[PDB]
RNA sequence: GCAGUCAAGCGUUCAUAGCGACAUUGCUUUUUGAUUCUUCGAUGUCGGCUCUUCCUAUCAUACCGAAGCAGAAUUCGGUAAGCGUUGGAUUGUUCACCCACUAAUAGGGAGUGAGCUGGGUUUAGACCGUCGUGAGACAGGUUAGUUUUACCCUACUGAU
RNA sequence: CUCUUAAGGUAGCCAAAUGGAUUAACGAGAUUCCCACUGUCCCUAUCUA
RNA sequence: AGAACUGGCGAUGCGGGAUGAACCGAACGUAGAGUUAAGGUGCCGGAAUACACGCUCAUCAGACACCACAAAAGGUGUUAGUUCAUCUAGACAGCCGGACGGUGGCCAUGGAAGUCGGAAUCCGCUAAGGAGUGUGUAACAACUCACCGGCCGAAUGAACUA
């Protein structure tokens, strides 16, 4: 590697105006589904992002009290933080938290069977291996091939029940990893439903 | 250099058309106007034709019967000040200026060399913008003549670093906190050791705050207050050179101390606790404020800019006697103090729980509001001089503007790349300077909520800044050794 | 699961936990390969060690995460009590660290195994293997402070008494040094210490007894001081949350005597400060240590301060001792019979 | 059960009559049982034991040292203390890689009898924008498990690493082929996105393109490390 | 692994010419057990019935040691290979998984390519895809397809 | 140079009875399942030339 | 790894290294006698169960590829050295006695009196005695060591090298 004044030097760089230009355009843009992205422009994104949350992360307790002092033989922790204000407010702060518990048992009764089968002393059956298919590494490998190979993925949908037959997951992957791949639905089996229903679904998916 | 990308073939033909003009059509529609103060009072209905915002002063000034000019706003959705009426009745929101203009600080004067170490602190004199002291990691402090850009008495005494410094509000005495155990009082003019050094604290000194003038008797010097890493606070008398009462409520180190309006010390400390401390009880606690999940860094007051300067307003034209200095110190205080005709000093804190609580300690030991926003720790907090906006510096490279009265979020300043260490205001309450872990300092237009001007200069980290009270001059100091002064 | 958590595996410190799981791979998996085997055989060998060492950890942590009682969504009494012993934030963090460290080991396993299928010699494969197991060892070495914490909470939380909130109980409360352990000693079978100084009991003890062919449960509970009441100790707070959360009766215990270094006005000031705990409850007061000193003997202005305690809507003020044990047997009968009326009046709704 | 039962039991009933005599002797024998374990314990149990005993010495040096040290007797601001943390490239002349290693041959056909496809076994930065090409037209296969996006860059100043995204591969030693496929190797010089560090040129512009040299062989462990050329 | 930090020592003699053990800090993505549905190109053959033996790097049974080991159950470790280690479902593939019994369903070696087979060697037939002007070949994919010993010496098992 | 999202309630208008290759029948063609039945198997035993 | 030179083998038997392309010895006609090389001398096996001074015990020593690898270290295994210390003003090992006063030092707290903790770690009387090495009490108590001292009487300790 031949020594050079190139390297050590700064290659790319950005204007302090141009940051102020690009930070605004996150606010403006606006996507349009009939439009589609070919190239992205190389941009220092970590500078342009961080938008305003209104909440903050939680405080770091480990710094103030370790663990050995929080509980043990070593244990320097006589009184609780933050602790309650007053014994009216404590007894107020119990009685709702009782009834909130007493709710969840009456709820998770009606959600249910699962315990009563264990009390009766029997288990539910084995799930059949065919209901997996598929799933399987051999075919999902075959999937991530053709996404990587293709320049427009298209995604065919059963025009009886397209919401059930969509899948999320891949579309969430595609936007994160590979935005240059274009993506487009095809409702088909448009015979097997009535004519208004197909016309509706293309409206609700367009 | 990555660019702002070019205008398209259509966007040229947009520009090539003649368009617009400012015009003002005539303009005379009779639209009704209400007048409202931001303090409290509503004052009831006029209905004129449309006019320039210079004239709506002259409509008000005869009605109230003053000659006080006034700043205007409208639509509070929106919040934004014919110039309104183009955006489409108007509730007009009037508010006093304190009439001024401090300029945007643009150019450097060339870099003043001196002591061969990092610069740890840097305080202007109150009364004039020529005089400015710096404390370095070299054991010398140094006072700079800032008009001539050159050293006025290179100053020696200590045998460790000098961490904080402060100029007394009357402007007789400088005080210098140290990494050893000591404080040394100095005269600016002579630059000589006023007796033996003040020794009392066992570990290093964290901050130094002066007793402000309007409390102190006319013809007595102001007492110092000094917080230290052992966690005590002592109150130093300058003449006798001896502490009256040690105060030892806090268990951990005290991060900063401030002397308040009404005889009341405040001490922000590493035991997650803010101790309101009455002077008249002769070293005694009155109220103990607990919110924070981490330790407390820094503690800003609403009055702190007025208490720091103490009588010397922007001209720097001196008090003829102490009895005058009493009244001048009281009048600059009572510009900001009587907001609704009542002395409601606001206190605010920063801490590593990523949060600032807002306090009014005389009225209630509860907090008012929880300013929550930042990702990493807030470090410096500052009220604006007029007690109207708060702003706080943080380690997530961004400075957040909060309304002072109700602790309500306003906006965020974005621009800084690396972590922001401290900030300071222009006296007119418009411009706002900030300093970073990177080279650059930046100055922030508070009215439009925007970057006014970036200024690069230094070779390394920049720890300290301060704005001069007149608002010609801004100092800076950091790791590259060189003091840079900045001006218009 | 409900009511006491004895069965949680046990959980080594990171030095030893690493020493287990690494050495189990050396033992259980085959340890010989030779370089002039076929590359498929060399790749299989090393793949299997990274996998097996992965699932060594992802076993060991999963038993911790499954074992430990899941502090919110237990029951608000227990949810509290484990805060007041173990600290609820440190508790929840320490487990959540182990939950994160579970995921990184899986990630490291799955990423390296996918590299290790392209390994073109023994050396490359061998280095990729050591590179995987070093990363796992580094993740687990970063777990030294939580595992030491959890190991000690496991030991303690096994040793708690099971109390049902839902059963008929009775709390037994007051100042230190009053008597209220030696009541619990003599009413039921239990080993609780009876020693003349303040905080002898430091946690909630339990004992059961049958009256009217029905299991009750007494709870002896360490003792309360009056205080400014924002700050009381983790020892004292147990009792306050016991009186707050649990249903049941409660016996207040006064010592009317010169004994206890504790003034008898301050016992009443305790009662009136604690009063808003009792609103749901049903209460009795018990004057322990009669035999020396008596309630009848007392000064009049002093004896007014019992009649102040009478004014609270639903109480009674029993004499008792532990020298004659017919009298202590009457106290439980009144205590139970006041309870069962409230349970039946609750049931018949 | 309930609370500190064994402790209460020891406090009342009391230990075991020859407990003291047992425990005292075990500590006497422990001297002998260390020296037996050292001269038995074959084969790994022997290695571990010695590795441990070295540490249990090296600690006891440092305790006795620190006692002898304690027997005798940069500068930052307030808000930063009470805290903690030629034009030679640093690797000139790296080992040369043959073209026959790196490029594994892939044969195609029912009779596996056509060769011609080549697989890059070394690690690769590929692009932002990639897509594979048709299987008939392809040849120089860079497989997806060996496609690094982010490197692990470190600074000679400061003493902090950051996990930074790769922007390009500019100079690759051992031929201009492997630059153009984007093969990371040891020695290779790569464009790094630097924005988490927060470097600013004098001029006031702020920087997000630094060249960095890779310090390790990321074949032999999956991580691509690198040092900034500052 | 890379980049450092401390320093018991080497470096002919040697503190501060360069090396340097044991410790130790940096991230490889959120500190509140949330999910984290990430399955991302093994270009090379193994897999299973029958049956034997060996190793121990011990899953179970035997005897010990240490743990907040009260019991009960369990974890970790020592000697230990005497003796065991199963039944099924799944090829839109199984370099694996699940559920069921069980004291327990440990890991390996020599395997059982002439004892018998299923995929793959693997040729002639045929179709679909990709490539080729074409003959044809292959990024593929699918279907049909004869190797049949012992009677010799030895070993082994029984027999004079 | 300018420019593309309308169809609405369990089966619709429509076109020379149907809206079709989701094609009947046939097959030593390839493959999955169910009943019946069984020494395929648990687990082998016996008999004839 | 590629260059340069000189040996050895290929065309070459024979003695030794248990066996062997390259290792140690060695000028091949056929015989006899003598003396040796390298290697050997318990028995197999020709030749000392020779002589002399030391070292080593391995619950599967070693008899060696050596001027390497697993290697750098772990051991209350043995012997010989080197450099500092301590000692009839009594060492080392044992028992016996002392180990105290300001004081229960300050904050901390339900309770912490040298010994759950955090900051200091000082003065006095001393032959000597830490604002305490550990066991131990809810806290104190009692015991212990580190340091003095009496009894006993002459060598002993520590760290390295081989
Ligand atoms: N004279 C007398 N003394 C009693 C009686 N009951 C208890 N005591 C005394 O109470 C002292 C011990 O108190 P505990 O019974 O432990 O009551 P407690 O300390 O409040 O209870 P815990 O804190 O839970 O142990 C003993 O010294 C007893 O002598 C009594 O009937 N008569
Ligand atoms: Mg008691």
CATH topology of chain B: Methylamine Dehydrogenase, Chain H
Which oligomeric state applies? part of a larger assembly
Main sheet makeup of chain D: 5 strands, mixed, barrel
Number of strands of chain B: 35
Got a strand count of chain D? Answer: 8
Q: What is the CATH top level name of chain B?
A: Mainly Beta
What Rg of chain D do the Cα atoms give? 31 Å
Heteromolecules bound:
guanosine-5'-triphosphate, magnesium ion
**Helical content band of chain D:** 25-40%
Q: How would you spell out the order of helices and strands of chain D?
A: HHHEEEEEHEEE
* Domain tally of chain B: 1
Task: Jot down its keywords.
part of a larger assembly, 4 chains, A: 206 residues, mainly alpha, two-stranded parallel sheet, 8 helices, extended, D: 230 residues, alpha+beta, three-stranded mixed beta sheet, 27% helix, binds guanosine-5'-triphosphate, binds magnesium ion, RNA-binding, ribosome biogenesis (chain C), Nucleolar GTP-binding protein 1 (chain C)
Task: Write structural notes for this entry.
Chain A: Belongs to the TRAFAC class YlqF/YawG GTPase family. NOG2 subfamily. Chain A: It is found in: Nucleus, Nucleolus. Chain A: This is Nucleolar GTP-binding protein 2. Chain A: GTPase that associates with pre-60S ribosomal subunits in the nucleolus and is required for their nuclear export and maturation. Chain C: It comes from Saccharomyces cerevisiae (strain ATCC 204508 / S288c). This is part of a larger assembly, with chains A (206 residues), B (488 residues), C (349 residues) and D (230 residues). The longest helix of chain A has 25 residues. In chain A, 41% of the residues lie in helices and 4% in strands. Chain A is mainly α and 206 residues long. Helices cover 8% and strands 39% of the residues of chain B. Chain B has four helices and 35 strands. In chain B, the strands form nine sheets. In chain B, strands 4-35-34-33 form a four-stranded antiparallel beta sheet, with no helix packed on it. The radius of gyration of chain B is 24 Å and the shape is globular. The two termini of chain B are 28 Å apart. With 349 residues, chain C is α/β, with parallel strands linked by helices. Chain C is 52% helix and 8% strand. Chain C has a six-stranded mixed beta sheet, sandwiched between helices. Chain C is elongated and about 100 Å long. In chain C, 35% of the residues are buried. The N and C termini of chain D lie far apart (65 Å). Chain D is α+β, with helices and mostly antiparallel strands and 230 residues long. Chains C and D meet through helix 4 and helix 5 of C and loops of D. Bound molecules: guanosine-5'-triphosphate and magnesium ion. Magnesium ion (MG) binds next to loops of chain C. Chain C binds three RNA strands through helix 1, helix 2, helix 4, helix 5 and helix 6.
């Amino acid at each position: 590697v031949q020594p050079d004044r190139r390297w050590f030097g700064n290659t790319r760089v950005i204007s302090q105006d141009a940051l102020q230009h690009f930070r605004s355009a996150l606010g403006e843009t606006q996507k349009d589904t009939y439009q589609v992205l070919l190239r992205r422009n190389k941009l220092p994104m970590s500078l342009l992002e961080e938008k305003d949350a209104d909440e903050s992360p939680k405080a770091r307790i480990l710094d103030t009290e370790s663990y050995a002092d929080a509980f043990g033989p070593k244990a320097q922790r006589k009184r609780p933080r933050l602790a309650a204000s007053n014994l009216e407010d404590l007894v107020k702060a119990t009685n709702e938290d009782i009834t909130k518990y007493e709710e969840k048992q009456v709820l998770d009764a009606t959600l249910g069977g699962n315990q009563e089968d264990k009390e009766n002393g029997w288990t539910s059956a084995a799930k059949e291996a065919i209901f997996s298919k598929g799933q399987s590494k051999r075919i999902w490998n075959e999937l991530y091939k053709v996404i990587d190979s293709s320049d427009v993925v298209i995604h065919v949908l059963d025009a009886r029940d397209p919401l059930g037959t969509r899948c999320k997951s891949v579309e969430e992957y595609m936007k994160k990893e590979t935005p240059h791949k274009h993506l487009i639905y095809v409702l088909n089996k448009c015979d097997l439903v009535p004519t208004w229903v197909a016309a509706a679904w293309v409206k609700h998916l367009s | 250099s990555t660019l702002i990308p070019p205008p398209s073939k259509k966007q040229k033909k947009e520009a090539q058309l003649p368009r617009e003009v400012a015009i003002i059509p005539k303009d005379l529609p009779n639209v009704s106007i209400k007048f409202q103060a931001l303090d409290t009072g509503d004052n009831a209905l006029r209905v004129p034709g449309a006019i320039s915002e210079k004239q709506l002063e002259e409509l008000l000034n005869q009605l109230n019967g003053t000659s006080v000019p006034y700043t205007f706003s409208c639509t509070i959705k929106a919040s934004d000040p014919y110039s309104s009426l183009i955006k489409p009745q108007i509730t007009l929101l009037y508010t006093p200026r304190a009439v001024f203009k401090v300029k945007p600080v643009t150019r450097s004067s060339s870099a003043i060399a001196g002591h061969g170490s990092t610069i740890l602190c840097s305080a202007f004199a109150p009364h004039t913008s020529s005089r400015m002291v710096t404390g370095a990691g070299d054991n010398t402090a140094r006072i700079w003549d800032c008009d001539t850009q050159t050293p006025m008495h290179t100053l020696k005494g200590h045998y460790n670093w000098v961490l904080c410094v402060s100029w007394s509000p009357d402007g007789e005495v400088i005080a210098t906190g140290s990494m050893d155990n000591t404080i040394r009082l100095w005269d600016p003019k002579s630059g000589q050791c006023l007796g033996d050094a003040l020794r009392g604290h066992s570990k290093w000194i964290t901050s130094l705050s002066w007793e402000p003038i309007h409390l102190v008797k006319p013809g007595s010097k102001p007492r110092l207050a000094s917080s230290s890493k052992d966690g005590t606070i002592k109150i130093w008398d300058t003449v006798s050179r001896v502490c009256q009462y040690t105060m030892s409520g806090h268990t951990n180190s005290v991060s900063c101390v401030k002397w308040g309006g009404q005889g009341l010390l405040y001490s922000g400390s590493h035991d997650r606790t803010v101790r309101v401390w009455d002077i008249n009880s002769q070293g005694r606690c009155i109220n103990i404020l607990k919110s924070h999940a981490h330790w407390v860094n820094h503690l800003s007051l609403s009055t702190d800019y007025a208490l720091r300067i103490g009588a010397f307003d922007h001209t720097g034209k001196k008090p003829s006697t102490p009895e005058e200095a009493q009244k001048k110190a009281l009048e600059n205080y009572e510009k900001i103090c009587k907001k609704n005709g009542n002395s409601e000093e606001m206190m605010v804190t920063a801490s590593d729980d990523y949060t600032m609580f807002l306090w009014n300690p005389l009225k209630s030991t509860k907090p008012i509001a929880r300013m929550t926003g930042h990702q990493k720790l807030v470090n410096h907090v500052a009220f604006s001089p007029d007690g109207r906006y708060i702003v706080s510096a943080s380690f997530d490279n961004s400075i957040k503007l909060w309304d002072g009265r109700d602790g309500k979020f306003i906006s965020t300043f974005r621009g800084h790349v690396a972590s922001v260490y401290q900030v300071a205001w222009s006296s007119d309450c418009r411009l706002l300077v900030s300093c970073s872990k990177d080279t650059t300092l930046k100055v922030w237009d508070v009215r439009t909520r925007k970057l006014s001007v970036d200024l690069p200069g230094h070779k390394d980290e920049v720890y300290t800044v301060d704005w001069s009270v007149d608002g010609k001059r801004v100092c800076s100091g950091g790791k590259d050794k060189m003091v840079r002064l900045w001006t218009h | 699961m409900q009511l006491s958590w004895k069965d949680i595996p046990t959980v080594a410190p990171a030095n030893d936990l690493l020493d287990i799981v690494l050495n189990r791979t050396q033992r259980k998996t085959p340890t010989v390969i030779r370089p002039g085997f076929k590359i498929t055989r060399i790749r299989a060998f090393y793949m299997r060690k990274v996998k097996y060492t992965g699932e060594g950890f992802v076993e060991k942590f999963e038993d911790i995460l499954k074992g430990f009682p899941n502090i919110n969504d237990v029951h608000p009494f227990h949810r509290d009590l484990m805060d007041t012993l173990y600290e609820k934030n440190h508790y929840k963090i320490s487990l959540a660290a182990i939950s994160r460290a579970k995921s990184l080991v899986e990630q490291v396993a799955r990423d390296y195994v996918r590299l290790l299928k392209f390994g073109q010699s023994l050396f490359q494969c061998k280095q990729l293997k050591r590179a995987a197991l070093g990363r796992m060892a580094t993740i687990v070495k970063k777990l030294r402070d939580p595992l030491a914490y959890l190991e000690q909470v496991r030991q303690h939380i096994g040793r708690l008494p099971s109390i049902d909130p839902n059963t008929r109980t009775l709390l037994i409360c007051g100042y230190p040094n009053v008597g209220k352990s030696s009541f619990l000693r003599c009413i039921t079978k239990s080993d609780v210490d009876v020693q003349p100084y303040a905080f002898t009991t430091k946690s909630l003890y339990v004992g059961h007894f049958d009256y009217k062919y029905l299991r009750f449960q007494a709870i002896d509970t360490p003792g309360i001081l009056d205080r400014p009441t924002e700050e009381m100790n983790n020892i004292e707070m147990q009792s306050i949350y016991a009186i707050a959360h649990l249903r049941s009766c409660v016996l207040y215990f006064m010592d009317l005597s010169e004994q206890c270094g504790f003034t008898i006005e301050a016992q009443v000031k305790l009662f009136h400060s604690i009063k808003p705990l009792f609103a749901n409850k049903s209460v009795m007061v018990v004057i322990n240590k009669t035999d020396i000193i008596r309630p009848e003997d007392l000064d009049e202005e002093r004896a007014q301060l019992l009649e102040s305690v009478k004014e609270v809507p639903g109480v009674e003020i029993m004499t008792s001792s532990c020298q004659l044990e017919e009298n202590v047997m009457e106290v439980r009968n009144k205590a139970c019979e006041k309870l069962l009326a409230s349970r039946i009046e609750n049931k018949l709704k | 059960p309930q609370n500190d039962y064994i402790e209460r039991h020891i406090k009342q009933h009391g230990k075991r009559l020859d407990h003291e005599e047992r425990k005292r002797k075990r500590e006497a024998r422990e001297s002998h049982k260390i020296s037996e374990r050292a001269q038995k314990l074959t084969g790994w149990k022997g290695k571990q034991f010695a590795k441990k005993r070295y540490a249990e010495k090296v600690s006891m040096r440092k305790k006795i040292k620190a006692h002898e040290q304690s027997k005798v007797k940069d500068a930052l601001p307030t808000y930063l203390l009470d805290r903690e943390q030629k034009f030679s490239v640093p690797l000139p002349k790296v080992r040369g890689i043959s073209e026959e290693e790196m490029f594994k041959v892939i044969k195609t056909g029912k009779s596996r009898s056509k060769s011609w496809k080549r697989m890059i076994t070394k690690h690769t930065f590929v692009g932002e924008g990639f897509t594979r090409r048709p299987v008939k037209m392809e040849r120089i296969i860079r497989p997806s498990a060996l496609r690094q996006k982010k490197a692990n860059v470190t600074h000679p100043e400061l003493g902090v690493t950051v996990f930074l995204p790769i922007l390009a591969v500019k100079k690759n030693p051992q031929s201009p082929m492997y630059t153009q496929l984007g093969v990371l190797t040891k020695g290779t010089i790569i464009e790094v996105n630097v924005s988490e560090l927060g470097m600013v040129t004098a001029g006031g512009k702020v920087v997000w393109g630094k060249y960095a040299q890779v310090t390790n062989e990321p074949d032999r462990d999956g991580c691509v490390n690198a040092v900034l050329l500052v």
